[PDB]
Design a protein around this ligand. Structure first.
Ligand SMILES: [Mg+2]
Ligand SMILES: [Mg+2]
Ligand SMILES: [Mn+2]
Ligand SMILES: [Mn+2]
Ligand SMILES: [Zn+2]
Length: 883
């Protein structure tokens, strides 16, 4: 019996923090059931898409959500839920005409950021007269269209700007799944090569719709012509009944985006495990990543762009410092006022009078109901003292209607805004155009911005909505929130717990070095309440205001405007404190896990082509050395050479002129030439060159270096017991793909054996090697590192002692494993050593298998919750100690 389970999921670009919390009836955290960081491991085809499940439509393929027709359908169906109250008792739906005007309005600009107050103003009603508003907290947009207009791919964006609906839809369908039309890729091939290269970085809205384009269009057209919502429209158009409902995609249904997809697998599996183990969660909270899990490369692009941002803003602060002799702290208000003055040409936007840096004041065009204001650049203007004093907390249009001040009006103000020009080198006309559009829009506004609520912190990113949809579908008795990525750091600061967590590192650099911080973030998000989300968002808004004034900030004192709000907030701070207690407790138990999936399937995967290296020819009659023989171009050749009666394990094949072997039927004589793999200049000698992983292909050979599936750990029996390993190449398992990979036979003529340690080869051929168990890259080793005080590793342990948990990152040689610390994140190293940087960041800890096994480390295998797995009935990989 469990009262309340709260699950928290902290989405990252390379990780997913996962936490499960138990709280009492009052919300006090009583037990941290789970806390881990899951690190990511970096026509006869399509359509294989499910058909439309609506009756009569089953011959049509379900449309992807990025299809313009789906975006349109989604907007329309959301608008078809909107209601208008003309009388305090009853609420009527929007008429067809109103619906058309609204949908037109919402699709004018996919890039416009609107609230429902905007829609209420378009409709000609008060905001409070508008109902039926995840339930869309904000108005919908054509996400696909916004993406196409924001892409950095010039030519594509241009083409998309240049019309039209049919062409747009066709192109999206082309880019997403269907190569046809023939119009594309002529349009695509016409595009510059650099852009055509960039094309794979384009991330259309993910998801598969429940219906086909045909049905989407039908339902849309219908809902736009009537007062029916989606339910009714389905009944009337298709005949289905009240109970009819389309299935939703599973959480882990692939969307074609690597990081997103592994995130989805992690989330789905975790939630399954949680519900199975402890029961159905009361709450599932998610902190989305903003921004964003489009890629790691695109994320690094956003990071570089953020560098650019930071530096140019810093340059702005410097400019104010040298231009105005500004002393000390330079507010966002000083910066904005200056920018506005330059833009408005030193004139009040409201009345036109001349202003300067001393005389001008900054105003919010539209006031915001309740605490705080909307602090967007587009809601800020430079104003004279008189206009600002007169306007007060009133919207500009309302104020201007009866201010009776000369040259003050919406028309005059918009006229001024249209006159704005760049005034800066290499500044985008795009951003300026957006800015002018926004300003004019707000100049027309006759209603306040809406008060901040519990949804102000909700993420509006497409993938956030899709994730919400999926989890809520999979857990229909559970409330689901997907917040914006800024909420955990806000929460931690506001509760004052950011320095109380016993994580590795010091409080508190920018980036964190302990990978367990994701588990913290998850725990925190699971604890989030509506009232607290509201309060936090308000505190941020206030902070923005006071930052625009430049004066002393008081927002930290704000913990709610009502009594219940402040009660909730204080209570919550108590809960955060308890959660800190629980987390540190669990950290002491070493039960805040750091996990990573291990790869057990064969590489898909080796189909890619490399430039074939030249094979070297040797006259068979001149004899061969063991090294030359071991690099024979085919295993059958190797067999032929080692089968020879005068073959010597040390001296290879002696020179003979009467030699004759048979390789796959063909006869090879002393005067004939056999081929071997070589990485030496052919003008050199390969008599002593040792064998390396390679396969023969058309025109020579290729190296299968990294392409290793697993390593089998053998104990060569002593005397002096000697541990060794066999790196099994993916190539050597293909024939037995459909079987047990870890028990499949690896013959002596295999390239794997031939590339193994000679001692191990000999041990295996003579039944002197004992199979201990297998490992793969990604596997976790628990190691006693007391005996390692020498070299780079020891110097690393001087700074990070008792670092016992390591991950296999590759096989350095045929006898050396490459390890890196699991709990530590390279992205949080502040001026490290050379040893620390070598172990963590660069080469890693490269350690001989014998040396490593001497301390008897343990291969650790973990389940869906991160817990060590020692036995399994499902024949899943279990943990084992290397003895
Ligand atoms: Mg004002
Ligand atoms: Mg306000
Ligand atoms: Mn986060
Ligand atoms: Mn995180
Ligand atoms: Zn003025």
């Amino acid at each position: 019996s469990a009262h309340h389970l709260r699950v928290g999921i902290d989405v990252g670009t390379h990780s997913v923090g996962l936490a499960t919390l138990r709280v009492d009836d009052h919300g006090t955290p009583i037990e941290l059931l789970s806390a881990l960081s899951h690190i990511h491991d970096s026509g006869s085809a399509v359509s294989r898409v499910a058909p439309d499940p609506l009756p009569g439509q089953g011959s049509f393929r379900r449309a992807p959500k990025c299809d313009p027709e789906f975006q349109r359908f989604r907007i329309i169906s959301i608008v078809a839920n909107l209601r208008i109250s003309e009388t305090k008792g009853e609420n009527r739906p929007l008429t067809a005409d109103e619906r058309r005007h609204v949908v037109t309005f919402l699709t004018e600009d996919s890039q416009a950021d609107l609230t429902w107050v905007d829609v209420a103003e378009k409709l000609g009603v008060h905001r409070r007269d508008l109902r039926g508003t995840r339930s869309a907290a904000r108005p919908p947009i054509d996400a696909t269209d916004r993406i196409m207009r924001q892409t950095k791919i010039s030519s594509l964006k241009t083409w998309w700007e240049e019309a039209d609906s049919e062409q747009r839809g066709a192109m999206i369908r082309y880019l997403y799944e269907d190569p046809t039309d023939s119009e594309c890729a002529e349009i695509i091939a016409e595009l510059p090569e650099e852009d055509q290269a960039k094309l794979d970085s384009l991330h259309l809205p993910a998801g598969r719709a429940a219906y086909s384009r045909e049905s989407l269009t039908a339902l849309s057209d219908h809902m736009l012509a009537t007062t029916d919502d989606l339910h009714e429209a389905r009944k009337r158009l298709f005949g289905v009944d009240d109970s009819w409902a389309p299935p939703a995609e599973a959480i882990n249904a692939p969307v074609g985006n690597p990081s997103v997809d592994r995130t989805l697998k992690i989330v789905g599996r975790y939630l399954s495990a949680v519900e199975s183990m402890w029961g159905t969660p009361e709450v599932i909270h998610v902190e989305h990543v903003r921004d964003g899990f489009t890629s790691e490369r695109m994320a690094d692009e956003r990071d570089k762009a953020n560098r650019r941002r930071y530096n140019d803003n810093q340059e702005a602060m410097k400019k104010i410092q040298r231009d105005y002799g500004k002393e000390g702290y330079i507010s966002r208000g000083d910066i904005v006022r200056l920018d506005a003055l330059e833009l408005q040409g030193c004139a009040c936007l409201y009345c036109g009078t001349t202003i300067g840096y001393h005389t001008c004041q900054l105003d919010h065009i539209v006031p915001q109901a309740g605490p705080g204001s909307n602090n967007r650049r587009g809601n800020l203007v430079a104003v004279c003292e008189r206009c600002n004093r007169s306007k007060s907390n009133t919207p500009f249009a309302v104020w201007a209607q009866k201010c009776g001040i000369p040259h003050v009006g919406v028309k005059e103000a918009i006229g001024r805004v249209r006159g704005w020009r760049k005034q800066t080198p290499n500044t985008s006309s795009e951003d300026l155009t957006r800015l002018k559009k926004e300003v004019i829009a707000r100049l027309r506004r006759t209603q306040e911005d809406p008060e901040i609520d519990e949804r102000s912190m909700e993420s509006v990113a497409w993938m956030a909505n899709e994730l919400h949809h999926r989890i809520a579908a999979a857990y229909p008795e559970t409330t689901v929130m997907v917040y914006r990525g800024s909420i955990t750091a806000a929460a931690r600061k506001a509760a004052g717990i950011d320095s109380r967590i016993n994580l590795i590192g010091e409080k508190g650099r920018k980036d964190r070095i302990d990978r367990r911080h994701h588990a913290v973030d998850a725990s925190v998000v699971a604890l989030m309440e509506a009232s607290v989300a509201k309060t936090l968002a308000e505190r941020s808004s206030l902070r923005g205001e006071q930052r625009l004034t430049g004066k002393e900030q008081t927002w930290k004192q704000y913990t709610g405007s009502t009594v219940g709000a402040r009660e909730h907030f204080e209570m919550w701070r108590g809960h955060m404190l308890h959660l800190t207690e629980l987390f540190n407790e669990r950290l002491a138990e070493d039960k805040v896990y750091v996990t990573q999936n291990i790869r057990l399937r064969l590489s898909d995967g080796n189909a890619h082509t490399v430039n074939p290296s030249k094979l070297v020819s040797h006259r068979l009659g001149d004899g061969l050395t063991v090294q030359q023989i071991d690099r024979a171009c085919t295993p059958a050749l190797w067999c032929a050479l080692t089968r020879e009666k005068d073959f010597d394990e040390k001296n290879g094949l002696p020179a003979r002129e009467d030699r004759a072997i048979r390789v796959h039927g063909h006869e090879i004589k002393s005067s004939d030439y056999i081929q071997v793999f070589s990485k030496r200049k052919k003008t050199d000698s390969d008599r002593d060159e040792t064998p390396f992983g390679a396969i023969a292909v058309r025109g020579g050979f290729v190296e299968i270096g990294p392409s290793i599936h697993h390593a089998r750990i053998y104990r060569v029996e002593g005397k002096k017991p000697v541990y060794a390993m066999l790196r099994v190449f993916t190539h050597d398992l293909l024939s037995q793909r459909h079987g047990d990979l870890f028990s499949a036979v690896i013959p002596p003529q295999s390239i794997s054996m031939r590339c193994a340690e000679p001692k191990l080869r000999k041990a295996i051929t003579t039944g002197n090697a004992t199979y201990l168990g297998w490992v793969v890259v990604g596997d976790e080793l628990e190691i006693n590192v007391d005996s390692f005080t020498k070299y780079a590793i020891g110097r690393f342990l001087e700074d990070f002692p008792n670092t016992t948990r390591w991950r296999i990152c590759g096989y350095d040689t045929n006898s050396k494993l490459t390890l890196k610390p699991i709990v530590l994140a390279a992205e949080g190293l502040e001026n490290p050593s050379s040893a620390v940087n070598e172990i963590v960041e660069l080469k890693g800890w490269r350690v001989a298998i014998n040396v490593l096994t001497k301390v008897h480390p343990t291969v650790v295998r973990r389940d869906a919750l991160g817990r060590p797995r020692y036995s399994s009935r499902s024949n899943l990989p279990t943990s084992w100690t290397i003895e």
